[PDB]
């Protein structure tokens, strides 16, 4: 969509096309509005990767819903479960050192 | 100060709505002669006041002795201008026959008056009106805007859109032209245009690689249609038409041809000029006689009777919706209210009082405007607001 | 009372076998002399009241010189009317065809009165007559109702409604013409409107609306004939002007082979057509599976109509609903030996042993308008006026 200044992504699986349309393919413009968040968030975003299909984007989430329930990380041995702790938790130290980790 | 059916609403839920009314089967516009200040135009009373001002000896002679209008409208500026041109037409004609020297002399010197104070108001860039690309001009930047919003959001297999107007200019064209679209008025051909009514009904198509296109219907007339002899009408451009005719118009004094011009609503009486005129309104009821139909309405003042009586009479069809502007809500209210207004005042406030979800009414003074009406229209999200071109073409045309 | 051939139910009891009748393919329904009096009717005894009481000194050849009535039903105000003036119609034609005076006279004397006090019953206006959109009016509203549902609870694909009628005035015609549809009674044209049977087999139809029928069974006021032996039916504004006004504004005048109201001169080979070939399409259309019909306002006082509703239930998918408000007054004189065969008709009816016979009963809850809302369901006004006045 285009509401007031910029874009907005909603995640709803029902506006079925026309016959005679013409499908397009996506830029690397229309694809930071899928895989983006809020702009007033900012100040409470960590960044974490890219995509890995393309290589182009980067990912950030908002840590008041990633820290507000618990957290499952899953994996088998040697592929970097030890690896993402090191870095989700070097990061809200660095954003905010009256905080309590253990 | 927006109501739906009595009730209130906020810029929220009416922004919405449009968005809902905008993705109907049938769409559609109704202009005025507001819209064109924003471009160098005038409204009908400020045209009675400059009339009143230079030509107060022949005010007399019309207010005496042939009747033909009424002093609280002189003097409240209420007067209908382009409904006494067609009457003293009338009796000029009668003159003619009955052979009564004294009376054509003193009708055509005070119709050579009305016509040099109508055209002078509707060129809308003075000398600068026979030349090219006038739409270049950032006078006309909203009469694009609403012309590419209305193309860019349709679908196949849905109707392309229709304007009507009341104006008798240029403007829409000028932009029309500048943008690369293409408009049908019922005209066909360069070296003899001549109207034919049956070419409403086509359209365009591609061969192998087409949808720019739209209707306008022109209720009242133009400044470059005209007729020569007894059958035809003819159409012809601007630089041609100030040479023949639009000059000494201005310039000179005491020029009047005849039975030639076709504006505004004036040669109404002849059987080769009325059908130009009825097949418009023919028209415009077939359209808003249709399931699923919406209008937007804007500069329009409510003083014709036929108009009303058609869109009254519209709104039995539940599937009919209607979307109007008028700044002066407030001071008609109690205008209304207390003794009474005017006809224009009761018509506008008897819709405000109803029991209807498909009738809305906006005011706001500044806040109910052409510029202000062009903004709530809803702007797609592929079409480019950025402008690469212009950055090349100064290149290509700096190469040397 | 809601009786059911031997047991009992409540409200919603039968709130549900109406909904669950009105789902079949062929839907019916029967009305007389009854539903009309909240629009301005009479029965058939004020009427016998009247003419006793506004002709009296007639009243007595009628039971001591021609022996056409009983003085026993006579006091006791239950005696058929149509009859007597069909009857009397046959001894006024064999007194002008064997050139006889006194007889002659003596009974177009009679035939006066009694069309007279039958019409004036059956205007339902007074002297707005012979005006328009009569429809439009306050006591036209459950008609139009009743109309529009039973048109409303129809599929796609499937029949039309069928409405029969004993009554011979315009409502139901007054009501549809002010909704819109289309009614079919067997005739066509403006100019001169004659009867065609065969026209009951038609049906509109869309290219890119809804209708019904109307079955008469006794005639009505616009239709007659001419000199020539055809039929023609006739508008009320013409009607009026042409011969009811001297009906009614007159005190001896007879035009003998005319009218058609109610069942007068079958003797006529060109008139009986026209009544024989409602009742076999009566006939033709109980005889169908899966049917349901519902009867509200009749007497009961007819051995055909009888025969036929009797006859018509063997086969067990023809469902009959009859209402009828003085039911106990009868349960309760039956005992006896007194009793008339309107009654006992009924009692033996409300003592079968199937689930088809649904005799009811409430004094006033039995009406015309309560079977109205047992029925399930489904601006212009301001408009219109604004672009009077504008
Ligand atoms: N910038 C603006 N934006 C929008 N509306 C405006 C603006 N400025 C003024 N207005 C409004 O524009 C209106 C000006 O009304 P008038 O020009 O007299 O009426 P007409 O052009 O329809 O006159 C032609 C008719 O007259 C005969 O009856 C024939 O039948 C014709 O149909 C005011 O209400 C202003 O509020
Ligand atoms: N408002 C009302 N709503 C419903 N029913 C009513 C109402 N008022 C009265 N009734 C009932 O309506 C009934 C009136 O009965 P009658 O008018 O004598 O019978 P008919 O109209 O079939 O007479 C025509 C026959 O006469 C010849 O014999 C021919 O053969 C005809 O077939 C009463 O029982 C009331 O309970
Ligand atoms: N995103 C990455 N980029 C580069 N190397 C990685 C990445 N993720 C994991 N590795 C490598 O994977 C190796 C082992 O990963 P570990 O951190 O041991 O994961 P793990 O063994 O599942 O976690 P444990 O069992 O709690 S020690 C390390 O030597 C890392 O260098």
Redesign the pocket.
């Known amino acids: 969509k285009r509401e007031l200044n910029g874009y907005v992504f909603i995640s709803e699986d029902w506006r079925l096309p026309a016959l005679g349309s013409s499908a397009v393919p996506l830029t690397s413009d229309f694809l930071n509005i899928i895989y983006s968040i809020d702009k007033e968030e900012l100040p409470k975003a960590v960044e974490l990767g890219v995509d890995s299909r393309t290589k182009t984007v980067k990912i950030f989430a908002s840590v008041d819903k990633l820290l507000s329930r618990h957290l499952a990380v899953l994996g088998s041995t040697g592929y970097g479960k030890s690896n993402f702790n090191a870095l989700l938790t070097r990061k809200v130290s660095e954003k905010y050192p009256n905080s309590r980790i253990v | 100060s927006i109501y739906q059916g009595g009730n209130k609403l906020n810029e929220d839920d009416f922004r919405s709505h449009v968005y809902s009314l905008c993705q109907l089967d049938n769409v559609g516009v109704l202009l005025?002669?507001?819209?064109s200040?924003?471009c160098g135009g005038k409204?009908?009373?400020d045209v009675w006041k400059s009339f009143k001002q230079n030509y107060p000896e022949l005010l007399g002679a019309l207010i005496d002795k042939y009747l033909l209008v009424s002093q609280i409208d002189s003097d409240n500026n209420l007067v209908?201008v382009?409904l006494l041109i067609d009457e003293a037409t009338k009796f000029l004609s009668v003159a003619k026959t009955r052979r009564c020297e004294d009376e054509e002399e003193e009708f055509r010197k005070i119709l050579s008056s009305l016509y040099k104070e109508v055209t002078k108001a509707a060129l809308l860039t003075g000398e600068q009106f026979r030349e090219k690309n006038q739409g270049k001009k950032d006078a006309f930047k909203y009469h694009k805007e609403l012309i590419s919003k209305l193309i860019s959001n349709r679908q196949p297999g849905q109707s392309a859109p229709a304007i009507f107007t009341?104006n008798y200019d240029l403007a829409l064209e000028w932009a029309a032209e500048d943008l690369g679209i293409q408009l049908f008025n019922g005209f066909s051909g360069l070296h003899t245009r001549q109207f034919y009514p049956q070419n409403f009904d086509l359209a365009f198509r591609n061969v192998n690689a087409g949808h720019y296109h739209a209707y306008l219907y022109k209720l009242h007339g133009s400044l470059t249609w005209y007729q020569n002899d007894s059958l035809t009408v003819n159409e012809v451009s601007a630089s041609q038409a100030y040479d023949e005719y639009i000059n000494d118009i201005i310039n000179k004094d005491d020029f009047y041809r005849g039975q030639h011009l076709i504006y505004p609503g004036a040669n109404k009486y002849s059987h080769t000029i009325g059908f130009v005129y009825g097949e418009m309104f023919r028209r415009f009821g077939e359209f808003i006689s249709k399931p699923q139909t919406a209008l937007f309405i804007?500069?329009?003042?409510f003083?014709?009777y036929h108009?009303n009586r058609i869109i009254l009479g519209a709104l039995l069809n539940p599937s009919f919706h209607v979307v109007i502007?008028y700044?002066?809500l407030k001071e008609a209210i109690t205008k209304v209210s207390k003794g009474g207004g005017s006809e224009a005042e009761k018509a506008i406030v008897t819709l405000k009082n109803m029991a209807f979800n498909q009738v809305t009414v906006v005011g706001g003074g500044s806040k109910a405007?052409?510029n202000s009406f062009v903004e709530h229209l809803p702007y797609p999200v592929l079409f480019p607001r950025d402008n690469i071109v212009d950055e090349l073409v100064e290149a290509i045309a700096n190469l040397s």
């Open positions: 005025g002669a507001g819209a200040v924003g409204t009908m009373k209908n382009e009341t804007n500069g329009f003042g003083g014709d108009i502007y700044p002066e405007y052409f």
